[PDB]
Each structure stands twice: as C-alpha cells, then as structure tokens.
Amino acid sequence: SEAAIDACTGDDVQLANINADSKLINVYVNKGADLSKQKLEFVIPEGATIKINDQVAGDTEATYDFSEETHSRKFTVTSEDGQWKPVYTVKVVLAELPTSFNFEELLPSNDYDIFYEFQPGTSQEISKVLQWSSGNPGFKLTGMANSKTDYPTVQVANGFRGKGVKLETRDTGSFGAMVKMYIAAGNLFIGTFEVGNALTDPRKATNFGFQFYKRPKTLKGHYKFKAGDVYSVEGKPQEGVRDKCDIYAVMYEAENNSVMLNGDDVFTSDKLVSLARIKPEDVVESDQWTDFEIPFEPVKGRVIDDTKLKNGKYKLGIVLSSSVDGAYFKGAVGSTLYVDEVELICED
C-alpha cells in the first residue's frame, strides 16, 4: 500500500523540505559540505524500499555524488506492494545559519512543535536555514503529553506581537522517575537531539552548534520569565533556591565537522572561544516583555582566527531554557520562558 519519503536526514543536512505534491525535496546543507560525498538517510513506509534511480562514478557505498550540474538526483520508492513507483527529485542546496530568528514557522508533525527558519534571499545570496532542536522527542517517551501544547517546547500566539516560543519545565511523571529524569526543562537550541541517548545520557543527547562564518558580538531579543512555585532537586521539593531561566550562545572551535559540544561540556570545553550568557542577577520576572542584549565575551582570553573562521572551523550555538539547571533535574515545574524574537549581531 504505502509509498513515499517521510523524512530525509544526513550528516551535513540542516533541514529538508519534502514537497509531497511536486516530489521535490530540497536538502539544505552547511556551506562547507562536500557535495560530491553526501551521506543521506530516508525514512519510508514499513516494507517499502528506496533505490537511487541511477549511479555515477562519484557514488560510493556510503555516499552519493551531488556535485554535477543541477546538484540533484532522483530516487524511486517502491511500495513493498510493488504497485506504486513514485519518483522523487532530491536537490542539495548550500545554506548558512540565520542571524535573525522569529519562531513563526513549524515543520509538520503529529506529536509536537518543531521550529525552523527559512530565509531564501536573492539568486545571488545563500539561503539562511535552521531547524531548531528541543527535548520534545525525549519528552514524548514519558507519555505525559496528551497534545502538542503539553510539551516543554511549544509555539504560542502572543497576541499583538505575533508568534513566539514558550518553554515550560514539565513534570515527567512515574516514567521520568524510573529513569531519574524527574523534570523536563523547556529548551530550544541550535544543534541536534540524539533521541537514542534521551534516557541513558540526556545531557549527551543535546548536541550544540553548526558551522558559522562571522564573529558574533551580541545576542538580543525580548523575553518574559515566571519561575514555578515548587523548586525540586532530583524529584524532591526544595526551598532556598528560586528557579531562573537561561539564555546563551557559544562559539567554539571544531577541528572537523563531527565535533559538537553537548550538555556536559558546553560551558567547560577547551574548544569554547566565546560565550554570551544572561547574568543570573539580571533575570527578572514580569508580565511585561524585557529586552535582553548579551555581549559575547572571550573565554579564557581565546580569540577567533580569521583563516579558521573563513575555513568553517568555528561553530555557533544558541540555547534557550526555562530552568537554568534543568538538565541536572534541578528546577521548578511550571517555570516558563517566553521569547518572541532573537537576533545575533555580528562584527565587521
């Protein structure tokens, strides 16, 4: 019966737009990706198989060559049924990270919100693309959410100011307790979420950053924050600490594209060259929007090198969280961070 491409991922892939009607899939990759050696995976219906329509000299057993003229290759998805042979055209497109984020658009999903940015530009300019990640795939496993709005990371309509992100620390229930993940902070971050590690190493599940080619100077936007009533540490109520949200960005050196920071080393890694992080004393709780303007400060006197920057050896991440220590299960259920927009101001 079923025959179509449901998803498309890959080592260099930042975002894929599958157009079910035209059978065209645009796959956006980092600006420094080797188009002649692309590793790609496709999710298709149970039983069906995926075969590339042709082979070229540059193809290997592990990668496909998209370096020819159109940067496109056709794939057929035979049903299993054997009755439908729908041909997709996969096109690889170079993209860079945006510097402006508005939380307006969501990728299709049946379970939870997935935010993305797509800023096409001119025919002479590179598109700016991002698929934001969050802990939502992990929270799905808890069985606590009944709808999209029950997740820690949700899109909201802020009335007159339009769309924004709502991050709320949630109770993970008995399931979370069994795996010692007593709460789930609402987060949104540049990078990837490795769902395979969601329960065994949740801090290693959050990988931060993608190649960035400019020097960041300031992280700006607006936010509202309200701490939850009952702060907890490893599932047990605890007085004496009031919950705080977190908003930060990092620039770090990645000797090769496989290198990423994660939840255990994002502030301590020797690879970290620059950090912009909201000061805890500056965090306020209000029903009014508050401006944030966080400067990027060098880490341990390190500098961004021109040649390395141009060569794609630095990566940037942005992270938003409703509970600053929520990744260690210290925070208050109900802590909520709203952000309407974020902008990265760069130098030069």
CA distance 183 to 234: 8
CA distance 108 to 74: 23
Please indicate, yes or no, whether residues 309 and 340 belong to a single structural domain of this protein. yes
Please indicate, yes or no, whether residues 341 and 216 belong to a single structural domain of this protein. yes
In 189-272, alpha helices (H): 202-205
CA distance 273 to 270: 8
How many structural domains are present in the chain?
A: 2
The tokens describing 269, both together, are 């890694």
Residue 40: give its domain's CATH number: 2.60.40.2340
Please indicate, yes or no, whether residues 165 and 58 belong to a single structural domain of this protein. no
Cβ 188 vs Cβ 208: under 8 Å: no
Please indicate, yes or no, whether residues 141 and 3 belong to a single structural domain of this protein. no
Nominal resolution (angstroms) = 2.1
Domain boundary among 56, 71, 94: 94
* Nearest one of 305, 281, 134 to 206, comparing CA atoms: 134
Residues paired with 121 in a beta bridge: none
Please indicate, yes or no, whether residues 88 and 99 belong to a single structural domain of this protein. no
Phi, psi of 288 (to 5 degrees): -95, 145
Please indicate, yes or no, whether residues 156 and 223 belong to a single structural domain of this protein. yes
Whole domain around residue 68: which residue ranges? 1-94
DSSP 8-state class, residue 196: G
Please indicate, yes or no, whether residues 250 and 322 belong to a single structural domain of this protein. yes
CA distance 164 to 157: 6
Please indicate, yes or no, whether residues 133 and 257 belong to a single structural domain of this protein. yes
Please indicate, yes or no, whether residues 162 and 199 belong to a single structural domain of this protein. yes
CA distance 224 to 310: 36
**Which residues make Cβ contacts (< 8 Å) with residue 348, sequence separation at least 6?**
214, 215
* Nearest one of 112, 118, 76, 73 to 95, comparing CA atoms: 118
Please indicate, yes or no, whether residues 135 and 262 belong to a single structural domain of this protein. yes
CA distance 258 to 240: 41
Please indicate, yes or no, whether residues 62 and 104 belong to a single structural domain of this protein. no
**Method of determination?**
X-ray
Q: Which residues of 81-107 are buried (b: 16+ CB within 10 A; e: fewer)?
A: eeebeeebbbebbbbbbbbebbbeebe
Cβ 319 vs Cβ 189: under 8 Å: yes
